[PDB]
Design a protein around this ligand. Structure first.
Ligand SMILES: Fc1c(F)c(F)c(Br)c(F)c1F
Length: 164
């Protein structure tokens, strides 16, 4: 298990434009195209991302290319964020993956409200952190995925994924 396999489980793989859990146009391995309700706007974003005129369908290779870029972008975003970098630096590699997972799903704007959780994670108060993380829109809207990510933060193991 690693961040790539982990996110592949959580996001799936679809080669045609689909709507994510929030109703937003997405493709590949959870590559958000746009929050716009316009399919044409989404197709434009896709074309721009891939570098060719696609009309809504990509190859597995192309999906994996965007996925690698997105994982990279998530890590780089954490390291450039003053609130996130210290907590990330304080973590072991397994829990770092859980961190990347969250940023991948919600972005930095989505994780802005996790200040108290972040403190508890840096303190390594794993059970308390886990309890706090679940008190969120995130957990309520995507409970099964949140549960996996939280278990990863709680235990520092891949137990929530090793079976999947
Ligand atoms: F949601 C979270 C993040 F987005 C994050 F970057 C880190 Br480090 C965390 F520890 C976390 F809980």
């Amino acid at each position: 298990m690693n961040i790539f396999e982990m996110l592949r489980i959580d996001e799936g793989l679809r080669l045609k434009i689909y709507k994510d859990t929030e109703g937003y146009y997405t493709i590949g391995i959870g590559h958000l195209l746009t929050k716009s309700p316009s399919l044409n706007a989404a197709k434009s974003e896709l074309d721009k991302a891939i570098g060719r005129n696609t009309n809504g369908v990509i190859t597995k290779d192309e999906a994996e290319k965007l996925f690698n870029q997105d994982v990279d972008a998530a890590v780089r975003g954490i390291l450039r964020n003053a609130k996130l970098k210290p907590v990330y630096d304080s973590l072991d590699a397994v829990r770092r993956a859980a961190a990347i997972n969250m940023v991948f799903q919600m972005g930095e704007t989505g994780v802005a409200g996790f200040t108290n959780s972040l403190r508890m994670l840096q303190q390594k108060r794993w059970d308390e952190a886990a309890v706090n993380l679940a008190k969120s829109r995130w957990y309520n809207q995507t409970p099964n995925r949140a549960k996996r990510v939280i278990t990863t933060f709680r235990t520092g193991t891949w137990d929530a994924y090793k079976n999947l």
